[PDB]
Design a protein around this nucleic acid. Structure first.
Ligand SMILES: [Mg+2]
Ligand SMILES: [Mg+2]
Ligand SMILES: [Mg+2]
Ligand SMILES: [Mg+2]
Ligand SMILES: [Mg+2]
Ligand SMILES: [Mg+2]
Ligand SMILES: [Mg+2]
Ligand SMILES: [Mg+2]
Ligand SMILES: [Mg+2]
Ligand SMILES: [Mg+2]
Ligand SMILES: [Mg+2]
Ligand SMILES: [Mg+2]
Ligand SMILES: [Mg+2]
Ligand SMILES: [Mg+2]
Ligand SMILES: [Mg+2]
Ligand SMILES: [Mg+2]
Lengths: 119, 109, 55, 117
RNA sequence: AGUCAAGUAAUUAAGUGCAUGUGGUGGAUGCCUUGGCAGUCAGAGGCGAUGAAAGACGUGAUAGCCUGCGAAAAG
RNA sequence: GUGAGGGGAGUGAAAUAGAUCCUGAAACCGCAUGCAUACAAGCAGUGGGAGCACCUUCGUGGUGUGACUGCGUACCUUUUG
RNA sequence: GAACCCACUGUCGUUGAAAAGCCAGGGGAUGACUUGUGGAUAGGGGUGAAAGGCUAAUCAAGCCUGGUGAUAGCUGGUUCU
RNA sequence: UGAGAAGCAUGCUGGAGGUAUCAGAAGUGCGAAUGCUGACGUGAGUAACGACAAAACGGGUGAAAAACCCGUUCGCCGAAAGACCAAGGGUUCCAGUCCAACGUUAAUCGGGGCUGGGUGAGUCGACCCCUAAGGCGAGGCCGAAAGGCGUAGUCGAUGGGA
RNA sequence: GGGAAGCCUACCUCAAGAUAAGAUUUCCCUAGGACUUUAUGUCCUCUAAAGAGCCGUUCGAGACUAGGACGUUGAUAGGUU
């Protein structure tokens, strides 16, 4: 029974799942377009969008929090200098998840994660 | 009447391939190709290869138009099976059989 | 536990009678005019008037 | 003088399997079951060749009784009258007439009833 | 012509059973021998310190194996 | 897929004689046609029996299926059984 | 109390990862200690701080080849009309 | 067709042997022996896909990339899951090329197939000199034969010698 | 006639595969040919109704199913406030 429960497991421990989601967020912020599995893509929003929401205000405390959550100086820099001002007047919804068939390896459903205003 | 095409040594069992072969029996060539392209089964690529071979043979040798063709008959036959030995616990050994099948497709009209 | 008698081919086929496959939902795209899975991105990179992987 | 048992054994098995066409399951494919099936069929035929006469006689008696009760009599009384009227018609022709020719059976019943009186 | 009521036919096969036609795996049968088995009639009944029986390594088609041969090495 | 495999052309008396190569059976596994089958209980047959489908030397005929019905608890050994 | 040797309890495993194991605990750990290499003891024999224990996954008498196609008042099977 | 074991004629495949009547000899008739050999079914597309640690993304080749290559992040061992000798196995070592079979999946990858290369010693080890346990043993003692023991000797490292 | 925690009703749940397959309210489908074996006959031409399903966002529903809500005429899920 998981009535009114939010979250995923993906067959991983807490630390492995957290590190994988952080790495996925960093890769997405670096390349602006990635291809992953469907549940991972749908769960990436809840960890990616709060970072962009936090980056909308440029303060020392916000920078330190973004660094503590990302652990990447280049990512924090690119975020606060590019993605913050870009989505200044947008009320959420900075990601786009599009189904892209299945993987030829294990027939797993795939999906493209994209930014709404890239390139 | 019927343009035939045979694929021997499919490296798959007949029971797993009959499930895919039952889908395209009686359909047109375009619908069958569309169904086989967007499927995730393993025997689908073999059935698609056999169907494309049959269609190409019908176009080249008999000079039949492709829009009038349809999957008239299709079936799967058993083939030679390889025998291997698998070591079990307590020194026992079991016999494993790798199965193979042939696919026959005849397109008509 | 193991069976006491053989299972005739009739009962085997009656049990297998639920192993039929099903087709997918394929539609013709309005922009490219190609067959594609519904609610899925076309193999070339086009979906809903937009085009990914600009070339 | 070595002798091989291929041809004659194959022919015997083929004859036995051909004598058992139409059976269900292994009774039409396996020799071990087909032999027993053929033997049982032979025994059943031997018994039914005797049972058939009783079955048909019972059918004839039932039809004659129906006709006699239609003509206001019973089977026993009509048979007794026909035996007293010196009529030697068997039950087969009587049942055939009762099923097909109603006026002839009525005349026979009238003669039997007159002989009873 | 139509409503209402009562009675009563035909129509389904996800699958299966039987018969026939057409195929697959499989290597029984039929035909044949390149190999064995048992004898007759004639031989011989041994090889070796001048290095025997049995082996290792080498020698040409080109790389290997089988036969032949031994740095004079299919002579 | 410069793969495997197959369809044409050609050789061959013969290619379901194509190198997994004379003939090539049974168990076992597919496809097509014909009939029956989703309210009725058991060694799965036997004696009757309506209908349906193709044949015809067009029948009180042939080939398949066969609803409904009476009867019916496998084979061999060892035992009084 | 570590390496090393051993195997007292429990869980799991029992067509197992393994024809004797894993994990959590446990005992000895300067000695009657553990271990490498090379030798000796051969079957009514050897060895045994002694359990009928060990002697190539086999021990109230190891394995192989011959007598040998041992014997069985016992069990099973024994084919066309 | 006959009471039976069976006989006869013929449609399709097959491509070279078969054999009347009467006599003679049998390796002369299979459904069972937890019978022997080979092939194939049910279970069933079910169980299972093998300690201590974990993976994600971008690009490349390629018919096909979760497993290959390059790069960017994460995690584990570190008295070992690191680096070497002895025993043991002989090409598994390196390069090019391939995916039929092997890899408990695919594979462009490999300790897989094919082709071509690679091991350089006065100082390392072996060989050699010497010997322990032990083996063999000229003469010799004993024993039906085979043979047993053993002296002078000769071998035998796990030891000593630049 | 009286007569008990006993039986049938009464209380809660399931229930028309009850093949005896029930009832009620509403909604939908009203064209042109050929042939034969003139029959809810067989082939053609022309439309696919009311609805159901496939698919997607999902659930206080759920092993897979099934069931409930929604799909630009939208607050079904995520994000933002
Ligand atoms: Mg929720
Ligand atoms: Mg040569
Ligand atoms: Mg009833
Ligand atoms: Mg019925
Ligand atoms: Mg009958
Ligand atoms: Mg201690
Ligand atoms: Mg015999
Ligand atoms: Mg037999
Ligand atoms: Mg018997
Ligand atoms: Mg299960
Ligand atoms: Mg990748
Ligand atoms: Mg090699
Ligand atoms: Mg290589
Ligand atoms: Mg190699
Ligand atoms: Mg001595
Ligand atoms: Mg010496």
């Amino acid at each position: 029974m998981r009535h009114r429960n939010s979250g995923v497991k993906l067959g991983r421990t807490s630390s492995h799942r957290k590190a994988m989601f952080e790495n996925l967020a960093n890769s997405l912020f670096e390349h602006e377009l990635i291809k992953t599995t469907l549940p991972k893509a749908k769960e990436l929003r809840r960890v990616a969008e709060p970072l962009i929401t936090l980056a909308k205000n440029d303060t020392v405390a916000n920078r330190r929090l973004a660094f503590a959550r990302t652990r990447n100086a280049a990512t924090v820099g690119k975020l606060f200098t590019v993605l913050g001002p870009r989505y200044k007047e947008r009320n959420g919804g900075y990601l786009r998840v599009l189904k892209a068939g299945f993987r030829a390896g294990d027939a797993a459903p795939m999906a493209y994660v994209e930014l709404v205003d890239r390139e | 009447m019927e343009v035939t095409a045979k694929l021997r040594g499919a490296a798959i069992s007949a029971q797993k391939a009959r499930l895919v072969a039952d889908l395209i029996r009686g359909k047109s060539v375009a619908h069958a190709l569309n169904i086989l392209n967007f499927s995730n089964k393993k025997a689908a690529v073999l059935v698609k290869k056999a169907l494309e071979s049959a269609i190409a043979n019908a176009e080249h040798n008999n000079s039949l138009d492709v829009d009038d063709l349809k999957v008239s008959t299709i079936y799967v036959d058993e083939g030679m099976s390889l025998k291997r030995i698998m070591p079990r616990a307590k020194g026992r050994a079991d016999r494993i059989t790798k199965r193979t099948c042939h696919i026959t497709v005849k397109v008509g009209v | 536990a193991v069976q006491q008698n053989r299972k005739s081919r009739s009962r085997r086929d009656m049990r297998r009678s639920h192993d039929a496959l099903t087709e997918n939902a394929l539609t013709v795209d309005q922009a490219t005019g190609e067959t594609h899975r519904r609610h899925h991105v076309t193999k070339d990179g086009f979906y809903r008037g937009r085009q990914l992987f600009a070339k | 003088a070595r002798v091989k048992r291929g041809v004659v054994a194959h022919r015997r098995h083929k004859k036995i399997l051909a004598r058992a066409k139409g059976y269900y399951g292994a009774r039409s494919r396996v020799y071990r079951v087909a032999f027993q099936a053929v033997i049982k069929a032979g025994q059943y035929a031997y018994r039914d060749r005797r049972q058939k006469k009783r079955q048909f006689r019972a059918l004839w008696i039932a039809r004659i009784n129906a006709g006699a009760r239609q003509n206001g009599l019973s089977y026993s009384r009509m048979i007794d009258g026909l035996k007293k009227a010196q009529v030697i018609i068997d039950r087969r022709v009587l049942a055939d007439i009762a099923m097909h020719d109603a006026v002839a059976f009525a005349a026979l019943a009238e003669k039997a009833k007159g002989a009873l009186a």
